[PDB]
Amino acid sequence: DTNQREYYLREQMKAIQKELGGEDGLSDLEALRKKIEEVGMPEAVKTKALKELDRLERMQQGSPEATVARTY
């Protein structure tokens, strides 16, 4: 009973925080997508930018590599 309560309250609060979030919260994903789509741009670096964006879309936090791909 305590474990099931823990799981329900845990994802309840996380869903609350998601709802308290509009436009994906701050949502730097769409911010860097707009930072791509509004400048330049050549075509092979378009593919490189979109694959680095897709590497950023899968993992979100915990590894250094997510922020590495962000800065890169």
Partner 1 sequence: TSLGRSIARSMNRKFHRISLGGVRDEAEIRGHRRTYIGAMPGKLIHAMKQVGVINPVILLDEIDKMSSDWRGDPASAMLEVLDPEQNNTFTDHYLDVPYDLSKVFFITTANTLQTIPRPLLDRMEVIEIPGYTNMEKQAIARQYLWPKQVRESGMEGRIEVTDAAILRVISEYTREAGVRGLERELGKIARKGAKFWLEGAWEGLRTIDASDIPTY
Instruction: Give the C-alpha distances (Å, rounded to integers) separating 65 from 30, 39, 44, 56.
Output: 19, 26, 22, 9
Site for partner 1 in 25-64 (CB under 8 A): 44
- Cβ closest to partner 1, residue 8 vs residue 72: 72
CA dist 30 and 15 (Å) reads 21
Check residue 22 and report its DSSP letter.
Answer: S
Q: What would the x/- binding string for a copy of itself be over residues 40 to 69, using CB under 8 A?
A: -----------x--xx-xxx-xxxxxxx--
| From partner 1, a copy of itself, none, interface partner of 72 (C-beta below 5 to 8 A by class) | partner 1
Is there a contact between 34 and 17 (Cβ–Cβ < 8 Å)?
no
Judged by the rule CB under 8 A, the positions of this chain that interact with a copy of itself are: 6, 9-10, 12-14, 16-17, 19-20, 22-23, 26, 51, 54-55, 57-59, 61-67
